[PDB]
Design a protein around this ligand. Structure first.
Ligand SMILES: [Mn+2]
Length: 587
């Protein structure tokens, strides 16, 4: 986990004999209050507070800009925020860095013409092709006021959350274990996308590596014994749906439990390395693959032979195991690298674990009535989607964590012991269906609680354009029990279920629930706790990824100010024109 910094640049009128001297304290204060707002509100994925760096002085002339640049170059700065209460000399004071985002906050004061600077400097940004965000508060503030108004706070934090996400991805790897899974497009990994858009490397390991490590004892035998004991005490094996001649013996199931535990360990060791392996004499394997995110191909070649990836996938994505409560390791079923990245976006913006799901079924009010006799009401009234992965899901996806008596998913450092216990208590692990997964294993089964606000998210590669992002804010649903059971028993009752209704807006692909499904670009989605659409739109514009589809209110759209120059009326097309022209950060 990197600690990318936000660089705060206090710019000032350069002229002295009184002018500059009298603005110094106010200008330096704006910088310090942004730093405080950020460091006391946001945290890195590891729970540490976000770190900021202020320029070595206020910036009135270019050599002060160069000094700031010098300091930032070596303080691991992933983005800048310029703050000012006054007029400053635009092109002499601006940050020229083309590979990171920039935001300018201009104080809305009258003696304090920060807004004139704001607009002038953003004009330079747009003219010189260096995208920058503009942060202007609705209400004139007194020259003395040091409160950051709420509209300003909101823009600053949104900008900062998205910037930090770009900073956390940069220079990390995606690891593939295996390759293409059952001709799924997202499993045909495109390194140009990772490299150009995300600043990321691609690593790769054939699944044979698992076998090698199991056969030769390349994992921690002490951990294994603690894991086996923990699993027996905490993991409840579920109902075996297998037909008579496919049902495994108690002995063979017990062996498979040992196997999937070692899978989890090896998967995790592959991603992030493990000091213990160096102690055991496997110095090369100890380093890992520097993976901020990864996937397991599984089907068909591995799952035809050996226990499936469900246990490994579930637990990497879950915020605890026998070693205690912890960050998740963002992990893609079927090596769907695009779903992995979709989950990664959500994860880095929220510090919360991520649901991987097949978008399995659209249930219309009509089909529910025919099948169950029940007329849908409330949030479910317009129909809904069955979100269900083929065996694995973050246990946090139960929705068993709670805030104000409402279901949520939490960053790991906020998880209480009773919440973790409730997640386990409400989860089952049915043996794998051996008509699909000959090699065996155990899937994960639970039902996500209703009434949880969530965002479903997907990146798709469009040939000759690149990645495009789709976003659907909505709510999890609680169906009447007999209705849930009917719909479930008829689909895949060995797997975990989330019932999802997207918010409809009457525009675009959100006129009906069917249209949301009909416009979804893959079999998979990434689903996070929270309504994070506006954050995703902001992140997307930083990465020059167009948004093909979202249900976020237009007034929450926050993009660099030069997008505006591509159009104010057809925001979608303006977004494609801007992303098209600017291209990916690292091309
Ligand atoms: Mn799938």
């Amino acid at each position: 986990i990197q600690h990318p910094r936000i660089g705060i640049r206090p710019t000032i009128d350069g002229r002295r004999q009184g002018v500059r001297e009298s603005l110094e304290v106010q200008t330096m204060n704006m910088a310090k209050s942004v730093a405080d707002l950020i460091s006391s509100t946001l945290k890195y994925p590891d729970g540490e507070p976000v770190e900021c760096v202020i320029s070595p002085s206020t910036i009135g002339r270019v050599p002060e800009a160069a000094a700031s640049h010098e300091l930032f170059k070596k303080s691991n700065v992933c983005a800048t925020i310029t703050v000012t209460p006054c007029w400053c000399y635009g092109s002499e004071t601006m940050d020229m860095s083309p590979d990171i985002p920039h935001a300018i906050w201009g104080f809305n004061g009258t003696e304090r013409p920060g807004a004139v600077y704001l607009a002038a400097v953003l004009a330079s940004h747009a003219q010189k092709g260096i995208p920058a965000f503009g942060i202007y508060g609705r209400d004139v503030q007194e020259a003395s006021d040091t409160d950051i108004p709420e509209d300003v706070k909101e823009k600053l934090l949104r900008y900062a959350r998205a910037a930090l996400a770009t900073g956390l991805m940069r220079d990390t790897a995606y690891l593939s274990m295996g390759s293409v899974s059952m001709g799924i497009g997202g499993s045909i990994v495109n390194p140009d996308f990772f490299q150009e858009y995300l600043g990321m490397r691609n690593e790769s390991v054939d699944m044979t590596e698992f076998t090698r490590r199991m056969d030769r004892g390349i994992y921690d035998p002490e951990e294994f014994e603690r894991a086996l004991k923990w699993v027996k005490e905490n993991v409840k094996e579920g109902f075996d749906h297998n037909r008579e001649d496919l049902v495994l013996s108690r002995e063979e199931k017990d062996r498979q439990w040992e196997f999937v535990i070692k899978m989890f360990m090896i998967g995790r060791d592959l991603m992030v390395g493990n000091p213990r392996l160096a102690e055991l004499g496997f110095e090369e394997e100890a380093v890992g693959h520097h993976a901020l995110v990864a996937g397991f191909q599984g089907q068909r070649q591995w799952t035809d032979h050996f226990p499936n990836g469900d246990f490994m996938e579930t637990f990497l994505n879950t915020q605890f195991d026998w070693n205690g409560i912890r960050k998740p390791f963002v992990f893609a079923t079927e090596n769907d690298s695009l779903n992995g990245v979709s989950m990664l976006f959500n994860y880095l913006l929220t510090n919360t674990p991520q649901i991987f799901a097949d978008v399995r079924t659209y249930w219309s009010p009509e089909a529910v009535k025919r099948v169950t006799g029940h007329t849908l009401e409330g949030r479910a009234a317009a129909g809904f989607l069955h979100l269900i992965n083929s065996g694995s899901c973050t246990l946090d996806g139960t929705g068993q964590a709670t805030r104000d008596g409402k279901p949520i998913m939490k960053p790991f450092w906020e998880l209480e012991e009773s919440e973790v216990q409730a997640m386990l208590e409400n989860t089952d692990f049915p043996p794998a269906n051996r008509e699909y997964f000959r090699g065996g294993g155990f899937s994960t089964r639970f039902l996500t609680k209703g009434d949880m606000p969530v965002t479903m998210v997907r990146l798709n590669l469009l040939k000759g354009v690149g990645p495009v992002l789709q976003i659907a804010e909505g709510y999890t649903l609680e169906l009447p029990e007999d209705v849930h059971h009917t719909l479930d028993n008829r689909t895949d009752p060995g797997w975990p279920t989330t019932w999802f209704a997207p918010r409809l807006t009457g525009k675009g692909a959100f006129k009906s629930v069917y249209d949301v499904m009909n416009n979804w670009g893959a079999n998979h989605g990434a689903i996070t706790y929270g309504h994070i659409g506006a954050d995703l739109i902001t992140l997307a514009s930083m990465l020059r990824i167009p948004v093909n589809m979202h249900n976020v209110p237009e007034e929450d759209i926050f993009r660099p100010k030069n997008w505006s120059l591509f159009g104010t009326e057809d925001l979608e097309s303006a977004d494609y024109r801007a992303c098209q022209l600017l291209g990916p950060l690292h091309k």
